[PDB]
Design a protein around this ligand. Structure first.
Ligand code: CLA
Ligand code: CLA
Ligand code: CLA
Ligand code: CLA
Ligand code: CLA
Ligand code: CLA
Ligand code: CLA
Ligand code: CLA
Ligand SMILES: CCCCCCCCCCCCCCCC(=O)OC[C@H](COP(=O)(O)OC[C@@H](O)CO)OC(=O)CCCCCCCCCCCCCCC
Ligand SMILES: CC1=C(C/C=C(\C)CCC[C@H](C)CCC[C@H](C)CCCC(C)C)C(=O)c2ccccc2C1=O
Ligand SMILES: CC(=O)/C=C/C=C(C)/C=C\[C@H]1[C@H](C)CCCC1(C)C
Ligand code: SF4
Lengths: 39, 72, 74, 74, 163, 740, 148, 78
């Protein structure tokens, strides 16, 4: 499990997880609050 | 072509061509004075840039003058 | 539209200037080639050693910047 | 009018490239560091990394945001 | 700039009416209650809400009938356009300083390890999450580093090429 | 003696090496000092012979990697069947394949992207597909989403089996080297067992499932009222209703009364007029005959029962007075070099994909494929591109063999040795051929453009001026048109309508028609010959001079992939065989772009279109023969005129193509920064940027480097190809979806 | 039996002897061409070569030139064009000789052609033979029975 | 050429005599009839003379090539 979590901590896996989180957050914000142009 | 392909490809190609001329009957009666070689690295950058720029300018000049003068 | 294209023009001016200025200031030497002044303004490269050194001369910075100038004036 | 504007702007672009080219040539061939010790020329050579890096930053900012606004509008 | 509010712009209203009309023209080829009909009606509802919201935000409209943003901080604050660029500027700068400070903190913390390069491509994920949480208080720490003199490395410790 | 030999449990199954990037390589396992290590890890990941010199370990890695690729392909295929089952208008299209556009992708409503769910018909909204799956599923007899679901589930089970096998044959039971070197056994099994039994089993499916269901479909029966395939399996009388010879059962087969089966094993030729596709009974007979031929072919090679051929003996016997020792030593090469095998197989596989493109457009094998113009254009273009890339790869791995696996001791005066010993003659003659072809192909167009601009159309190379008729191809067309009369008497019709004869029309649209050839066709075919010969010149020159040249006599010591041997000898950039692959990719792109442009314009101008009482109204109205003999004709009447659909696509469901058109133009232009520049500039720029990071104490420990010279070239050509090909992709698809 | 051998038995001169190079028909035919008559004067070999080449070039000019569709004018224009090409090639041959010239065994004397004076006589012979061959081509278009 | 040339009716007649066998006339007979009919202006592109020419000549050339190889290959060792 230690070796597996080290693999999950390699740069592309962390990049995949973080960018999936960020893209999903942006997508769900735009789903819940459609068409934001201004604050 | 001058900007993407670089020198050593052309030098080996020219070597085969120089072999061909020396071995071809009725043509090897004539010889070069200057040994044919590929253009230098810097010369290639220059010549590619010159063709790129001249084509850029000629294309836009034709488009500009034709598009404006065909209407006006 | 004038706003957007003027900022494109600013990008072109600043990038062409960056290439030209970096070429002029690194013309005498850089970390990759600390004795570049000994080789002159225009030379092909310093060979594939030290990672490879294509287009390291200041002349090559001019050559790269002409593309950006043509893009900018375009 | 269109031909004259385009003609003189392309001529201006080529000339500006040449200006910076001959500045680089000056730095290689003619610049004497001992004769310019501590003056404005030597001092701008002495912070060339700051100048180049700031030109890089402004070019990157302009490119990222101008292209991004255009692509968003597209 | 000679603009008009979008809520009183005729071009803005014409654009809303034309977009709704195109979507409604697409609608009259499907039965009611079908998935295409529901999807098109949802798009129509979103279009109407979007035009109403852009009118109600006080956005200015050009002769194109489209919203134009005001970005001078003076004109924005006095005429109620701070939500267009100024407040987004503050929000972006806060998040960007957060990201940069978290990255700097992680790099500095990794510099003291026995194998500093290992943490750069095999991420210390608990440490990264802890540092990422602490990036919320970045302006205070960064301003203190600026006044103290520890934000910047001294020029005598940085490599430079021969001049 | 051919036998199964494995090693038990050679490699432990553990995540320990997953946690150590670059473990496979002795240089890379120590970890990075610079960012170059990050790229080198990916570049060297599948270079097995660089990791070790043991042929057994390399072969085991290759076998298990092939299982992994098969599992990925099965996941992809099951995905396509699943999206047909779940996210498609397939059943509605089955009820009305002439008016309903196939769609099997639906986008979610967010950020306005639901406009891409176009009104494709059948009460359905989605992205229109051009892969041809609907026509393939209909030809197979699939009538419901349940059968598509079943294939998707079965594919995922088989995908898991492939991934299990790759793990199993690497970690548990890894075959030894002598198992892999049983090329006689592998050829016998792949000819008779894979291809032969595959064709026999597919003939079985066609006869028992595809033939009766499609017969009922083309009769006009509603697909929901057609009996399921197993009803045709279990009820022989039901099948005998459609094919009366089935009442006799298998007795005509066993008594050699094969002509009784003539109702479902036919030799009609041509196309089914209802669907515009090839007759499925013809396909059943074709696959049966193919199966028998391959089953016979798989008994040629000696394995364990004395009879059969030794391939080494065959090769060593074929030598002549011109060729020295002939094919001696080739058996040792092809049983010890994986790269030599890859070179051969890539060359033939790519040539096969290109042949497939031509044969499927000319003889459309699926119902309602030929009038789905988007699908026709897409599959031609796709298989052409796959073929070209595979051929360039053949050149690459031939060169890799020459650098790494060639041994002069085992090649003394054989064919390979003698080819190397006159490489200058080969390359110089091919150089002359390329120059001659370029002059007498492209210069004809330049002559025509200049004559037309000067107001001298009578001085042009054209059908109404100085003519260049392709008389040999015209004679071939006439011969193939006249074939059912004399030279193929039991075939009712020619193989394709392209040779001559009448228009095949489906739903008021042309499925296939004669493709006449005039001066413009002559000119563009010699363009094709020129571009193919130049691409051959680059790749073959890379192979022949991979080890040495007059310029660099010790090039093999520098390896397959190296940037140069320095600025000396005038300058030696791109001497490596890898760089010949790099240049050959561009010329492959140029060649295949002209080929697919030729296809698109000629089909739109001379084949595709609507049928009226008067005749055929083609999409671009026959303008190929009028203007394809000038470059300006191509630029205006093809590129400028046909790009109207992609640049007007905004605000429609085709707007994704307009965006991809622009983005692909961008990616293409972006590539020129990598191709035109050099890493010395970029490394110095990075020095200044690194100074800025050092000042703020944000310099990384993994020291940033510019890309290597070779990586700069690889990035440049990858983005060039991606941008150009995706530009043509969006142009083609928007054009033919909107006007098809 | 092997029909490809090193050039003159020397494996290290960059040439191979093949049936194309060294068949008795090919080597006999090439030896009797005027280019390979080493002892014959370069002027007369130039005359023969010029006759052959000036005659042959008129054909494309006659049948494919801009005036090819004008009866009578087509032949005269094609022959004047061929004469212009012959004169241009004479200039090229002459400037080749002035620049190119500033042992051989089977012992052989070197060609008098491969000298400055010999090449200049060759150029004169080329010019005379080429103009004569162009004129003879015109005469043939005016006199051949089945010419069209 | 070092071709070892030998007088070859075995191949001149090794293809022509089998090609003069009547099947549903013969290839050689049809070829000669086409030559005679075309000798009475070049043959058109619809004429069977081209196909008869190509088939007969590829058969004769392959027969001659295989005959030369068989005579020389057996003599020099197979
Ligand atoms: C990691 C990014 C991320 C974040 C922050 C969210 C956040 C949210 N999702 Mg979302 N989701 C994501 C990725 C994410 N999702 C992905 C990759 C999928 C599959 C495509 C989904 C599929 C999904 C569904 C099907 C639903 C949510 C719902 C929700 C909401 C309640 C849980 C919340 C706003 C639910 C909802 O919309 O609100 C109740 C809901 O029904 N999500
Ligand atoms: C369209 C063509 C194109 C593009 C986009 C660029 C881009 C760039 N050039 Mg290169 N250039 C080009 C053509 C181009 N060039 C050509 C033909 C030459 C002649 C060889 C050069 C020569 C050149 C020199 C000599 C220099 C540049 C520099 C720059 C930068 C300018 C600053 C900037 O705009 O930052 C913004 C960056 C961009 C606009 C790049 C694209 C950014 C993308 C869109 C970000 C998003 C990526 C996406 C999300 C990732 C998806 C990946 C996917 C697989 C998942 C930028 C990286 C200068 C530089 O490096 O300054 C810092 C520099 O010194 N250029
Ligand atoms: C790029 C810098 C820039 C430029 C060119 C302008 C330009 C302008 N500003 Mg803005 N401004 C800026 C940055 C800028 N601003 C910043 C950073 C702030 C925050 C400190 C402001 C806060 C501001 C205020 C509070 C006001 C302006 C005003 C103005 C206008 C008249 C200013 C003047 O000089 O009158 C002499 C002019 C259009 C005035 C305006 O709103 O109406 C004319 C005004 O009252 N500005
Ligand atoms: C720790 C992260 C970090 C920080 C604090 C900085 C800071 C700086 N960068 Mg550097 N940069 C980074 C990462 C970082 N960079 C990476 C990963 C790259 C490779 C893409 C670069 C490439 C780069 C260039 C080419 C340039 C800068 C420049 C600059 C300066 C101006 C700001 C800017 O232009 O942003 C622009 C930043 C980018 C375009 C890349 C940012 C990529 C992400 C968003 C940052 C990395 C986040 C990191 C992975 C977080 C991990 C933390 C976590 C484990 C806890 C400033 C000194 C400019 C200059 O020198 O100004 C004087 C300049 O020209 N950067
Ligand atoms: C090469 C194969 C391939 C490709 C390119 C696609 C592509 C797509 N699929 Mg299809 N799929 C495939 C194979 C494929 N699939 C196979 C083998 C199955 C059977 C298991 C499916 C079953 C499937 C379903 C059931 C759905 C898709 C959906 C989608 C779309 C959105 C996917 C997404 O956003 O993930 C989200 C990305 C994540 C990282 C979240 C993953 C979360 C899950 C639960 C794990 C996208 C067009 C969706 C759709 O089209 O919406 C209308 C959808 O609902 N796919
Ligand atoms: C009749 C016997 C038979 C059949 C049908 C095959 C078929 C195949 N072999 Mg070949 N093989 C055989 C005998 C056979 N082999 C023998 C006797 C040897 C040793 C001399 C080999 C040595 C060999 C090597 C070294 C490789 C292959 C590979 C392949 C695949 C080629 C790519 C392809 O077209 O995939 C088409 C795929 C399908 C049609 C999907 C279904 C495939 C089924 C499930 C497998 C059936 C064949 C298998 C041998 C049956 C045994 C069952 C197993 C549980 C014991 C394909 C699966 C290549 C590879 O891809 O393997 C991973 C490869 O590298 N084979
Ligand atoms: C349109 C762009 C272009 C052009 C014209 C060429 C030209 C050529 N390429 Mg280059 N190439 C290009 C793009 C181009 N390339 C690019 C972008 C790359 C980077 C990948 C390359 C990389 C490349 C490689 C790797 C190779 C070539 C080769 C060739 C030659 C092919 C043989 C031939 O056709 O000769 C005929 C010449 C032409 C068809 C050019 C047009 C000539 C006109 C019609 C004649 C005009 C004569 C003029 C009127 C008389 C002079 C009058 C004037 C002085 C007043 C030819 C010189 C191959 C070669 O060298 O093999 C022999 C070769 O191996 N190219
Ligand atoms: C005896 C030699 C001879 C002569 C004087 C001609 C004479 C001519 N031929 Mg002919 N020809 C010959 C042998 C000859 N041909 C041979 C061996 C073939 C191959 C079967 C042809 C095939 C041929 C064709 C296909 C055509 C000619 C045509 C022509 C005319 C142009 C010209 C009158 C053309 C003609 O008949 O009408 C314009 C034409 O189309 N020839
Ligand atoms: C349509 C395709 C283009 C056709 C014309 C292109 C010609 C390009 C190559 C030049 C011919 C090179 C001859 C060297 C090759 C060489 O070694 O020749 C010798 C070759 C056979 O030699 P041997 O009898 O020694 O061969 C014994 C073999 O078992 C070992 O190769 O006979 C030929 O004449 C080959 C045919 C050349 C014509 C090929 C036409 C293809 C159709
Ligand atoms: C532009 C260019 C470069 C500069 C390009 C470089 C250095 C590539 C940069 C790639 C990425 C963007 C670097 C950063 C990768 C990190 C993994 C980023 C992490 C940050 C997250 C946001 C993902 C060269 O090095 C070069 C070398 C040789 C010939 C031509 C060229 C050339 O044209
Ligand atoms: C607003 C603007 O225009 C310039 C501001 C930046 C500073 C003060 C530059 C840095 C200093 C810090 C305190 C230490 C490094 C060198 C400097 C110049 C003294
Ligand atoms: S490839 Fe680069 S480093 Fe090598 S010789 Fe050419 S320019 Fe110099």
């Amino acid at each position: 499990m230690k070796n597996f979590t080290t693999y999950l901590s390699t740069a592309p896996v962390v990049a995949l997880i973080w960018f999936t989180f960020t893209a999903g957050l942006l997508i769900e914000i735009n789903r819940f609050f459609p068409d934001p142009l201004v604050f | 072509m001058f900007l993407i392909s670089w020198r050593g490809y052309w030098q080996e190609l020219i070597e085969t061509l120089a072999w061909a001329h020396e071995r071809t009957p009725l043509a090897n009666l004539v010889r070069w004075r200057d040994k044919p070689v590929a253009l230098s690295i810097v010369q290639a950058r220059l010549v590619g840039l010159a063709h790129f720029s001249a084509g850029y300018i000629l294309t836009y000049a034709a488009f500009l003058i034709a598009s404006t003068s065909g209407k006006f | 539209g004038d706003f957007l294209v003027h900022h494109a023009i600013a990008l072109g001016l600043h990038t062409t200037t960056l290439i030209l200025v970096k070429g002029a200031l690194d013309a005498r030497g850089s970390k990759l080639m600390p004795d570049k002044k000994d080789f002159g303004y225009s030379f092909p490269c310093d060979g594939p050693g030290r990672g490879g050194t294509c287009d390291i001369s200041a002349w090559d910075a001019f050559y790269l910047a002409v593309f950006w100038m043509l893009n900018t004036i375009g | 009018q269109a031909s004259l504007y385009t003609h003189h702007q392309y001529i201006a672009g080529f000339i500006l490239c040449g200006a910076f080219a001959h500045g680089a040539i000056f730095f290689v061939r003619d610049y004497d560091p001992e004769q310019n010790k501590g003056n404005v020329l030597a001092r701008i050579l002495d912070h060339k990394e700051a100048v180049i890096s700031h030109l890089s930053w402004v070019s990157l900012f302009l490119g990222f945001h101008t292209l991004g606004l255009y692509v968003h509008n597209d | 700039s000679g603009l008009t509010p979008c809520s009183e712009s005729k071009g803005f209203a014409k654009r809303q009416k034309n977009e709704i009309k195109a979507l409604t023209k697409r609608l009259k080829q499907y039965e009611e209650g079908s998935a295409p009909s529901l999807a098109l009606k949802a798009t129509i509802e979103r279009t109407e809400k979007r035009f109403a919201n852009y009118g109600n935000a006080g956005l200015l409209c050009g002769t194109d009938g489209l919203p134009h943003l005001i970005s001078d901080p003076g004109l924005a604050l006095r005429f109620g356009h701070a939500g267009e660029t100024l407040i987004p500027t503050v929000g972006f700068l806060y998040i960007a300083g957060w990201i940069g400070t978290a990255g700097r903190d992680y790099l500095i913390a990794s510099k003291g390890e026995a194998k500093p390069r290992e943490k750069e491509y095999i991420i210390d994920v608990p440490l990264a999450l802890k540092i990422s949480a602490q990036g919320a208080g970045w302006p205070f720490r960064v301003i203190r580093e600026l006044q103290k003199g520890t934000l910047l490395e001294k020029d005598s410790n940085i490599t430079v090429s021969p001049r | 003696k051919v036998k199964i030999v494995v090693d038990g449990n050679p490699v432990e199954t553990s995540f320990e090496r997953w946690a150590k990037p670059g473990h496979f390589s002795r240089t890379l396992s120590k970890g990075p000092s610079t960012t170059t290590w990050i790229w080198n890890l990916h570049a060297d990941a599948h270079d097995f012979d660089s990791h070790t010199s043991d042929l057994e370990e390399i072969s085991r890695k290759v076998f298990s990697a092939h299982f992994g690729q098969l599992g990925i392909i099965l996941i992809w295929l099951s995905g396509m069947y699943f999206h047909g089952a779940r996210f498609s208008n397939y059943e509605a299209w089955l009820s009305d394949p002439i008016h309903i556009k196939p769609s099997a992708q639906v986008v979610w409503p967010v950020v306005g992207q639901e406009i891409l769910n176009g009104d494709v018909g059948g009460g359905f909204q989605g992205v229109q597909i051009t892969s041809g799956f609907f026509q393939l599923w209909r030809a197979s007899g699939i009538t419901s989403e349940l059968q598509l679901y079943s294939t998707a589930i079965g594919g995922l089970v088989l995908a898991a089996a492939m991934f299990f096998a790759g793990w199993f044959h690497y970690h548990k039971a890894a075959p030894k080297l002598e198992w892999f070197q049983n090329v006689e056994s592998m050829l016998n099994h792949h000819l008779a067992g894979l291809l032969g039994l595959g064709s026999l089993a597919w003939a079985g499916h066609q006869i028992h499932v595809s033939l009766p269901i499609n017969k009922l479909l083309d009769a006009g029966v509603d697909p929901k009222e057609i009996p399921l395939p197993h009803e045709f399996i279990l009820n022989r009388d039901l099948m005998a209703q459609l094919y009366p010879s089935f009442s006799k059962g298998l007795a005509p087969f066993f008594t050699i009364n094969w002509s009784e089966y003539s109702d479902f094993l036919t030799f009609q030729g041509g196309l089914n007029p209802v669907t515009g596709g090839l007759w499925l009974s013809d396909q059943a007979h074709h696959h049966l005959a193919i199966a028998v031929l391959f089953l016979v072919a798989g008994h040629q090679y000696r394995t364990n029962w004395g009879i059969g051929h030794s391939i080494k003996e065959i090769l060593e016997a074929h030598k002549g007075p011109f060729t020295g020792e002939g094919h001696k030593g080739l058996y040792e090469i092809l049983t010890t070099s994986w790269h030599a095998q890859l070179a051969i197989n890539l060359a033939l596989f790519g040539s096969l994909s290109i042949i497939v493109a031509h044969h499927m457009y000319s003889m459309p094998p699926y119902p309602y494929l030929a009038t789905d113009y988007g699908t026709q254009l897409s599959i031609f273009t796709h298989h052409t591109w796959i073929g070209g890339f595979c051929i360039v790869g053949a050149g690459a791995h031939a060169a890799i063999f020459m650098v790494r696996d060639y041994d002069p001791t085992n090649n003394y005066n054989n064919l390979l040795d003698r080819v190397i010993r006159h490489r200058d003659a080969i390359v110089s003659h091919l150089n002359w051929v390329c120059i001659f072809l370029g002059f007498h192909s492209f210069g004809l167009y330049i002559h025509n453009d200049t004559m037309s601009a000067l107001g001298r159309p009578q001085d042009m190379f054209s059908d109404t001026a100085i003519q260049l008729q392709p008389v040999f191809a015209q004679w071939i067309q006439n011969t193939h048109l006249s074939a059912p009369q004399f030279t193929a008497p039991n075939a009712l019709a020619p193989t394709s309508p392209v040779w001559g004869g009448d228009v095949v029309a489906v739903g008021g649209k042309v499925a296939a028609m004669p493709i006449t050839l005039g001066t413009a066709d002559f000119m563009v075919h010699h363009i094709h010959a020129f571009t193919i010969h130049v691409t051959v010149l680059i790749l073959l020159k890379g192979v022949l001079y991979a080890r040495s040249s007059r310029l660099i006599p010790d090039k093999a010591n520098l390896g397959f992939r190296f940037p140069c041997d320095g600025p000396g000898r005038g300058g030696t950039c791109q001497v490596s065989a890898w760089d010949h692959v790099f240049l050959g990719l561009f010329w492959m792109y140029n060649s295949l772009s002209i080929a697919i442009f030729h296809f698109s314009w000629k089909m739109q101008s001379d084949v595709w279109g609507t049928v009226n009482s008067t005749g055929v109204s083609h999409i671009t109205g026959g303008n190929f023969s009028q203007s394809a003999n000038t470059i300006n004709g191509w630029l205006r009447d093809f590129l400028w005129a046909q790009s109207s659909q992609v640049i007007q696509s905004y605000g429609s469901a085709l707007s994704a193509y307009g965006l991809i058109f622009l983005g692909a133009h961008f990616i293409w232009a972006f590539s020129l920064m990598f191709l035109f520049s050099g890493r010395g500039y970029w490394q110095e720029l990075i020095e200044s940027i690194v100074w800025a990071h050092n000042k703020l104490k944000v310099a990384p420990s993994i020291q940033p480097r510019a890309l290597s010279i070779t990586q700069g070239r690889a990035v440049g050509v990858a983005h060039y190809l991606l941008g150009g090909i995706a530009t043509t992709w969006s142009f083609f698809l928007a054009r033919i979806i909107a006007v098809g | 039996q092997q029909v490809i051998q090193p050039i003159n038995g020397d494996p290290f001169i960059g040439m191979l002897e093949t049936p194309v190079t060294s068949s008795p028909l090919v080597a006999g035919f090439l030896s009797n061409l005027p280019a390979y008559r080493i002892g014959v004067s370069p002027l007369l070999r130039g005359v023969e070569i010029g006759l052959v080449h000036g005659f042959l070039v008129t054909g494309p000019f006659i049948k494919l030139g801009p005036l090819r569709n004008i009866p009578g004018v087509a032949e005269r224009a094609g022959c004047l064009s061929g004469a212009g090409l012959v004169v241009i090639l004479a200039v090229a041959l002459t400037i080749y000789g002035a620049s190119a010239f500033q042992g051989v065994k089977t012992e052989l004397q070197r060609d008098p052609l491969q000298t400055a004076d010999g090449w200049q006589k060759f150029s004169a012979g080329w010019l005379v033979g080429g103009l004569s061959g162009v004129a003879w081509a015109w005469i043939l278009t005016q006199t051949l029975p089945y010419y069209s | 050429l070092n071709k070892d040339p030998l007088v070859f009716v075995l191949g001149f007649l090794g293809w022509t005599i089998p090609a003069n066998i009547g099947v549903s006339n013969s290839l050689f007979g049809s070829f000669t009839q086409s030559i005679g009919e075309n000798l009475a202006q070049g043959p058109p592109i619809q004429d069977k003379f081209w196909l008869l020419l190509v088939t007969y000549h590829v058969g004769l050339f392959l027969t001659l090539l295989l005959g030369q190889i068989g005579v020389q290959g057996r003599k020099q060792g197979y």
